[PDB]
Amino acid sequence: ASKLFSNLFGNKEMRILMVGLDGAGKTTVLYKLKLGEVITTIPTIGFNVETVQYKNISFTVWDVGGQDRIRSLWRHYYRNTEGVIFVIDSNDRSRIGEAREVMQRMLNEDELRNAVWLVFANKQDLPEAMSAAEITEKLGLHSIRNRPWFIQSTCATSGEGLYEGLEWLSNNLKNQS
Numbered sequence: 115a116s117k118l119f120s121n122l123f124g125n126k127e128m129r130i131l132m133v134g135l136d137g138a139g140k141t142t143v144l145y146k147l148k149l150g151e152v153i154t155t156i157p158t159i160g161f162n163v164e165t166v167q168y169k170n171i172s173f174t175v176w177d178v179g180g181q182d183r184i185r186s187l188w189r190h191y192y193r194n195t196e197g198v199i200f201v202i203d204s205n206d207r208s209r210i211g212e213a214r215e216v217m218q219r220m221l222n223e224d225e226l227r228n229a230v231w232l233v234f235a236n237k238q239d240l241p242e243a244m245s246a247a248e249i250t251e252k253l254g255l256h257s258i259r260n261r262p263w264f265i266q267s268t269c270a271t272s273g274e275g276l277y278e279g280l281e282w283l284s285n286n287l288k289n290q291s
């Protein structure tokens with residue numbers, strides 16, 4: 115319903131996990147992609163998961179936070195993930211430390227070791243927000259080793275940057291059977 119993601123994604127199977135702190139703009143991203151109905155599943159009371167399935171592309175999304183208590187189920191999703199999209203509210207300096215802590219925990223998860231890392235520096239339409247370079251430094255992305263990563267400036271409201279990021283992801287994502 116969006117445009118040409120059919121040519122991009124083709125018929126390959128990309129299993130994508132999109133997470134980030136609440137308020138980052140993940141749900142906005144899902145709807146803006148216009149790739150399919152956003153499905154809400156609650157595998158466990160209090161744990162809301164949103165999914166979008168487009169041909170062989172799957173997006174699984176949920177909110178994370180500094181005080182998260184990971185559950186076995188989370189790791190079940192992790193094992194089935196080929197690419198991770200971590201969404202950041204570029205205009206929230208008060209929570210960038212929290213995002214860093216959460217993302218660092220994920221970078222150290224055994225079950226996510228092979229996933230390529232795409233960071234969405236979202237809400238870039240706000241001039242007072244942090245730049246992608248600032249976010250790259252704060253998250254410590256340059257210290258990442260043996261794992262492809264990329265940071266993309268985005269505005270989920272307008273959809274700007276979303277294709278560029280998913281393009282990188284599609285070209286770098288490593289398939290796992």
Ligand SMILES: Nc1nc2c(ncn2[C@@H]2O[C@H](COP(=O)(O)OP(=O)(O)O)[C@@H](OP(=O)(O)O)[C@H]2O)c(=O)[nH]1
Pocket residue numbers: 134135136137138139140141142143177236237238239240268269270271272
């Ligand atoms: N300026 C701006 N805002 C954005 C962007 N993306 C999402 N937002 C806004 O950020 C708030 C949270 O987005 P949402 O998708 O629900 O976040 P989440 O799902 O990650 O928790 C929403 O504000 P509301 O509660 O006011 O609707 C939404 O409109 C963006 O690129 N730029």
Ligand SMILES: [Mg+2]
Pocket residue numbers: 140141142
């Ligand atoms: Mg949401």
